[PDB]
Design a protein around this ligand. Structure first.
Ligand SMILES: [Zn+2]
Lengths: 121, 75, 49, 166, 182, 114, 23
RNA sequence: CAGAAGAAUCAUCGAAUCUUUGAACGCACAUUGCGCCUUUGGGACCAAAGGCAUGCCUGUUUGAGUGUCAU
RNA sequence: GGACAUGGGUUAGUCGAUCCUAAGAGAUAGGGAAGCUCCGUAUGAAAAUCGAAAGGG
RNA sequence: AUUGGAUAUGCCAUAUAAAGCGCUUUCGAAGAGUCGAGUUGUUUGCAGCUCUAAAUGGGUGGUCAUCUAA
RNA sequence: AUUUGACCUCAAAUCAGGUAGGACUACGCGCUGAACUCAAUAAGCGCAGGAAAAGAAAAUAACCAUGAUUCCCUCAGUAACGGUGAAGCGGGAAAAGCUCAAAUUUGAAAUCUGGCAACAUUUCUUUUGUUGUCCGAGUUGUAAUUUCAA
């Protein structure tokens, strides 16, 4: 099968053409199965299916990194590019606004913080 | 003389419990937004509760949680 | 009848595939208790409902 | 500060001025909807001492409920259900008539950044405060369920604790 | 049939002019006369507070002056804000008081005419909160107070105070104890 | 003097700050998925050399325009009629009657299922 | 005044339906 | 069993895909029913991609008001 | 054998559904209810839909 | 590969400020259809309704003691 | 005449950005609630979390006084009510305190969301911010100081 890394160092159109010829080959392999083929062809059906899956994977990755580059350093980005941990974590308070304190509390923690002490036994 | 139907296949829950005239499923309560459930039917709850299906997303979340919900690509 | 809907036909289609005999090679596998079919239905017998 | 004068005037509800204003206002809210937005509170002194600030994020809704359970608690529950993206901060009586009691409910938008960045109201954004009006955690809710401090205000009896060694 | 919002808009007006109004509210719809109001706003136009841009220009100017080589004059402006005005009345620092005639919650201004009379402060009720808003560069100003001016403006400030006395205190002076409306 | 209907306010179109989906989705009904397999049963084989027709097992979402476009883009053969049915097992079978210019035998030979 | 008088006139027949008790 | 031969029905798993539905969201659904908007492609028509639920909040735009006013 | 096993078999612009509506059901604007929700659907709004494989086509 | 907190070390900050403590020659703002009372209902507590407060006042316990609600 | 600009109210948008629903329910908080004290139980309805609730006295006491809440032993099957059935004190587990409204910064709205442009930072090209500029919110009160222990 095609190696994923050398699939990555190619351009969009070549992967598109490789995708197209793979589909021709898969269609040819399946009609051999219907009309009667050898075990090599029946086993080749699976490996060519996986190789199209590899090409779809690398194409989608290249598109998504391209989109992330386009939306890099922006306030709003597509919901697919946004993180998805849980709905609760997304709705929760961020650490910055959990650490926000009034100036009254800032003065209190400036002047009377939790001191470092000890007792002699 | 028994050649009519009272219930049909439900869209939401896939059982032949969706009444035709009333147009409400006796099993899941569709088209009500809330799924029909009753605490006296403990066995009825456990036949349709979570875990009787694929739980495809919940298994995804659990494996994600076990690692602190990290994202990106390793070295 | 001869006026069934698509959903009825599709449900019939898989119900016809479910009651088929089991391939022998899956029986011949090791650690495979499957040696017969316990979901074999017949049209004259129990209805699909 | 004028809020002292506003508060002292609100004490005397049988005054001629208060009676005229209440009747005119209650009439106005009648052909208004049952629940309607109020861009500015009708009792700014009451709203401020109940926790309302004139900043983006605080919402005032006016609700009328018929008389004849606690009307203030019912008003909070209905407004909370009607605005599902808002946390019910508090509520206060504004007006009444022969059959309709009028309340104004203060709500806070937890999704707004002016609320999420304010340390003095940030507590309401936490998920433990979803639908306080329904769980009975508001001022009128606490008073209705009898939560208080003193001899005046079940599971410890219906159980028979069996220790290891006995 | 007209929408319900405009129906209620007209119906509130008719009832406010129809019902028996207690004197504490009846004193409001009697306001200052035209020409006195224009002279009021002509005087206040001189003493409107500095805008945000003017404030920023002053702040950066004094900041760079202090930074490079180095305190300003006494500000003269009209005093706004309900609490700040009420404080000035309490301290008797205010010389003239202007109250908008159409405050939405009327209790916010109902106590003022009694309070200025108790402190002997010249007060007048002027038309529309919007005009006061433009004076102080705001959308809404419920009350304005003039407490200090320049020396050359003291003469006509005394004159307009006498004029508003004549047209608001010498005239009327009975609506505060007359059952208005009806 | 009657029917106080709403005034006409302009209808601003959508001006999003970001697309709701990061990348567009490739066409999900392409000719390769449309034409799944050909039937070579004897009844279909009879139709092959008695009606200039090919019997294809097509995707269950395909409509007559789509198989027409699919076979044209996959075989460059010009059909004249298409008839679709759904088999009792839940699979769509399409009879594509070609034009008299093309030969069903030659197409079957080049596909490789005769 | 005319609008309210018309309102009462229509309510006399169309919007009668007052009978406020439904068990 | 056959089969070719970084393999494997391996483990881990942070990158993706995820069809029709379902709170289910263009309108409906005992119907592979009926639509509309934008763009593209094909040799009017078809196809493809992206969209169109409800209530509420903040802001934007346009308004409506013989509501209050200033010229 | 209608049972079992292996296969094959239902081709529509013109036949039906799909379209329309009847009895009827019911969204919406509003009004109630502690509430899941009931009345309301031409109704005092800044404007439907479903329902017939024996009806109409 | 992450981090959580400290130690050593470097760089920015801007204090013309802010805060704690002892005195007053001073004033000390404090939550209303809420408390409370009558009546009906639920297991003092709560709710419906008539009525409706005060500012060394109000609540609680037997003039005193203790708290400072809405 | 009437044209121009404000403020107020109310609309409309497939406007920009967000949010609510549904599911689980052992534990948690409410509403409601029978029958054979049963039982503030079962059922029904609403709503959360990793705990929930309660919580820094409008509290106990009558003492040489105790001092937020929660849980455990004890008080005690006592007081009380007509079978129901506490609490104070005492011993432990754990401990942590606080925040607003009510007073003028009046020599200066010192406050804040959003748009735009950079700078950054990340469990992360997925996160969270900083500065500058514009508009808006806001004097019908956003900031700083004050919460009775003062
Ligand atoms: Zn169902």
């Amino acid at each position: 099968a095609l190696k994923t890394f050398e699939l990555r160092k190619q351009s969009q159109e070549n992967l598109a053409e490789q995708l197209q010829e793979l589909r021709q080959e898969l269609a040819s392999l399946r009609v051999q199965k219907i009309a009667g083929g050898s075990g090599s062809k029946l086993s080749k059906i699976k490996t060519t299916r996986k190789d199209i899956a590899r090409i779809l994977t690398v194409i989608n990755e290249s598109n998504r990194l391209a989109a992330r580059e386009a939306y890099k350093n922006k306030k709003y980005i597509p919901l697919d590019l946004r993180q998805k941990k849980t709905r609760a974590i997304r709705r929760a308070l961020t650490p910055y606004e959990q650490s926000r304190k009034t100036l009254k509390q800032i003065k209190k923690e400036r002047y009377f913080p939790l001191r470092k002490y000890a007792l002699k036994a | 003389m028994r050649h009519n139907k009272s219930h049909t296949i439900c869209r939401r829950c896939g059982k032949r419990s969706f009444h035709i005239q009333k147009s409400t499923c006796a099993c899941c309560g569709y088209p009500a937004a809330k799924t029909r459930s009753y605490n006296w039917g403990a066995k009825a709850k456990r036949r349709r509760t979570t875990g009787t299906g694929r739980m495809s997303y919940l298994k995804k979340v659990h494996r994600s949680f076990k690692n602190g919900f990290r994202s990106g690509k390793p070295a | 009848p001869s006026h069934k809907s698509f959903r009825t036909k599709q449900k019939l289609a898989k119900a016809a595939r479910q009651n088929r005999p089991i391939p022998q090679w899956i029986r011949l596998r090791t650690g495979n208790t499957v040696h017969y079919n316990m979901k074999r239905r017949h049209w004259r017998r129990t209805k699909l409902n | 500060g004028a809020y002292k004068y506003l508060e002292e005037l609100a004490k005397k509800k049988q005054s001629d001025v208060n009676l005229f204003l209440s009747r005119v206002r209650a009439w106005e809210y009648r052909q208004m909807n049952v629940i309607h937005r109020a861009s500015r509170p009708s009792r700014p002194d009451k709203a401020r001492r109940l926790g309302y600030k004139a900043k983006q994020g605080y919402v005032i809704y006016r609700i009328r409920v018929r008389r004849g359970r606690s009307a203030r608690c019912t008003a909070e529950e209905r407004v909370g259900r009607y605005c599902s993206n808002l946390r019910v901060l508090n509520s206060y009586w504004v007006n009444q008539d022969a059959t309709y009691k009028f309340f104004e409910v203060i709500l806070v938008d937890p999704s707004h950044k002016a609320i999420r960045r304010d340390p003095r109201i940030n507590w309401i954004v936490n998920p433990v405060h979803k639908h306080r009006e329904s769980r009975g955690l508001t001022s009128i809710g606490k008073k209705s369920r009898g939560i208080g401090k003193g001899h005046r205000f079940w599971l410890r009896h219906n159980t028979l604790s069996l220790r290891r060694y006995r | 049939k007209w929408p319900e919002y405009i129906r209620l808009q007209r119906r509130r007006k008719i009832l406010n002019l129809r019902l028996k109004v207690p004197p504490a509210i009846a004193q409001f719809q009697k306001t200052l006369d035209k020409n006195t109001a224009t002279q009021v706003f002509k005087l206040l136009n001189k003493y409107r507070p500095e805008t945000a841009a003017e404030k920023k220009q002053r702040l950066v100017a004094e900041a760079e002056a202090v930074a490079n080589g180095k305190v300003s004059k006494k500000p003269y402006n009209v005093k706004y804000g309900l609490n700040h005005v009420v404080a000035l009345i309490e301290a008797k620092k205010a010389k003239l008081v202007l109250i908008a005639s159409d405050v939405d919650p009327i209790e916010l201004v109902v106590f003022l005419p009694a309070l200025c009379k108790k402190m002997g402060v010249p007060y007048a009720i002027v038309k529309n909160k919007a005009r006061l808003g433009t004076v102080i560069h705001q959308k809404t100003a419920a009350v304005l107070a003039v407490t200090e001016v320049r020396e050359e403006d003291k003469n006509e400030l005394a004159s307009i105070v006498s004029a508003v006395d004549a047209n608001f205190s010498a005239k009327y002076d009975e609506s505060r104890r007359k059952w208005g409306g009806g | 003097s009657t029917t106080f209907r709403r005034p006409k306010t302009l209808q601003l179109s959508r001006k999003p700050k970001y697309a709701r989906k990061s990348v567009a989705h490739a066409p999900r009904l392409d000719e390769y998925k449309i034409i799944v397999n050909p039937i070579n049963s004897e009844s279909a084989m009879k139709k092959i050399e008695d009606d200039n027709t090919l019997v294809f097992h097509v995707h269950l979402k395909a409509n007559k325009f789509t198989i027409k476009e699919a076979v044209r883009k996959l075989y460059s053969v010009e059909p004249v009629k298409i008839n679709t049915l759904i088999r009792p097992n839940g699979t769509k079978k399409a009879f594509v009657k070609l034009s008299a210019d093309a030969d069903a035998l030659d197409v079957a030979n080049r596909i490789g299922f005769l | 005044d005319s609008m309210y008088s018309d309102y009462t006139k229509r309510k006399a027949e169309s919007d009668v339906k007052y009978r406020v008790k439904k068990a």
